[PDB]
Amino acid sequence: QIVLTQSPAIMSASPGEKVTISCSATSSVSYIYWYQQRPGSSPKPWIYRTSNLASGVPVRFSGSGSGTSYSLTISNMEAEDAATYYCQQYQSYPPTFGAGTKLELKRTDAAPTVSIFPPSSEQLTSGGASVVCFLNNFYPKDINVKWKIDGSERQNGVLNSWTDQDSKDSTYSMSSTLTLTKDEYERHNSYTCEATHKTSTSPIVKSFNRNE
Amino acid sequence: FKEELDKYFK
Amino acid sequence: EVQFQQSGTVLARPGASVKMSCKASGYTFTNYWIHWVKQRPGQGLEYIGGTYPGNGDTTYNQKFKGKAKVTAVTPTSTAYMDLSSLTNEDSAVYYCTRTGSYFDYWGQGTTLTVSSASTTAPSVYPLAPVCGDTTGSSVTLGCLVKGYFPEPVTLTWNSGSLSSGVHTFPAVLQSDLYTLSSSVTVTSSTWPSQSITCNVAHPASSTKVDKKIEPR
CATH class of the missing domain: 2.60.40.10 (Immunoglobulins)
Structure with missing residues (x-):
């Protein structure tokens, strides 16, 4: 099947900025097709036969190219354009798609709002103990979270999960859960969530002390 | 264009 | 509006089979090819196969021949995909999609998990x-x-x-x-x-x- 290569894999763009992404094929193709996929939903047709806009696609989008080289352009980036775009070919069978260009909206920096939570009484009755840290509504997505117990970092047992850019304010959010045994949890006093983010020179820290 | 693509899948 | 209603999230055991459905509406079902496309976590899209419900013509990406079987039932405007001999590589989201002269309408996806893990309440x-x-x-x-x-x-x-x-x-x-x-x-x-x-x-x-x- 024909391999389509998309460039760049990831990029961010400010509101108003012109955006151009690329599709490169190993064989000449007569047309390329582009699909948009918003986080959490199905792909949608975006551009068909190289340059025609699909139903509902705003005029700031355009496509062009020929041979082995095609591109999709946004004349001025808007928040609703943040999405993954795939190119696609019917020159040979089966149809194939590129691996995607993920387009993110570059908004202004925002520090995470950090919240830390002790294990619940319910979980302790079962012999486990999870400490949870939420880091909400930050930008950019580059962040590092560390757990410190009585001042020593704890690296094993940490599960992290993230949301994609918020539909309203374009920020990211993250959850971090450190799971210990109940006995372990009870042998220490200080529990700290520490975040390193470009919005602060020092780490952004929330803490609690067991039974205090 | 639909007829062409139909033949391609056939 | 053209719409595809796909069957819900499904768990299947390695080695078993699974049938996924796609109920179409908003157009003349018999006159368009309907296809299935696979998307694994974090990767691009992969074409599987499709069918023309007007006469039963069915064609496949050769990779999925003998692995996937696509059928359509025109009186209920429903397309199906059956996947057999399941392994971990089959865990993915599966979309049904129509073509006119491109993939012009897509279902919401069906997530398939292939695993031998035990069902466990939260x-x-x-x-x-x-x-x-x-x-x-x-x-x-x-x-x-x-x-x-x-x-x-x-x-x-x-x-x-x-x-x-x-x-x-x-x-x-x-x-x-x-x-x-x-x-x-x-x-x-x-x-x-x-x-x-x-x-x-x-x-x-x-x-x-x-x-x-x-x-x-």
Whole structure:
């Protein structure tokens, strides 16, 4: 099947900025097709036969190219354009798609709002103990979270999960859960969530002390 | 264009 | 409007088969090719095969021949894909999609998990600030949903009536069990004077849990 290569894999763009992404094929193709996929939903047709806009696609989008080289352009980036775009070919069978260009909206920096939570009484009755840290509504997505117990970092047992850019304010959010045994949890006093983010020179820290 | 693509899948 | 309603999230055992459905509406079902496309976590899209319901013509990406079987039933405007000899490489989202002169309409996707892990009901844990204290005019609460299998669980706050200020995070798999969490931010004169409850449904284990978030 024909391999389509998309460039760049990831990029961010400010509101108003012109955006151009690329599709490169190993064989000449007569047309390329582009699909948009918003986080959490199905792909949608975006551009068909190289340059025609699909139903509902705003005029700031355009496509062009020929041979082995095609591109999709946004004349001025808007928040609703943040999405993954795939190119696609019917020159040979089966149809194939590129691996995607993920387009993110570059908004202004925002520090995470950090919240830390002790294990619940319910979980302790079962012999486990999870400490949870939420880091909400930050930008950019580059962040590092560390757990410190009585001042020593704890690296094993940490599960992290993230949301994609918020539909309203374009920020990211993250959850971090450190799971210990109940006995372990009870042998220490200080529990700290520490975040390193470009919005602060020092780490952004929330803490609690067991039974205090 | 639909007829062409139909033949391609056939 | 053209619409494809796909069957729900499904768990299947390695070596078994699974049938997925796609109910079409809004167009003359017999006159368009309908296809299935696969998307694995974090990867591009892969074409499987399709059928022309007007006469039963069916064609496949050669890779999926003898693995996938596509059929369509025109009196119920429904297309089906059957996948056999399942392995871990088959866990993915499967979309049905129509072509006119391109893939012009897509279903919402069906997520297939292939696994031998045991079905396990979730434990639901309330997350509240230590001592019930706050640091300003907003307070963040949460719900930790741990130790369940398979996906999905659905989580709402106050039966869905509390929807703004919510962040519900994607589940993370570890050692055949999922962990999910959700935070909710309200005004500090709202909670605890008003009730906040996380509602968790895990249909695979036939479980629903309501957990009220209490201070301290």
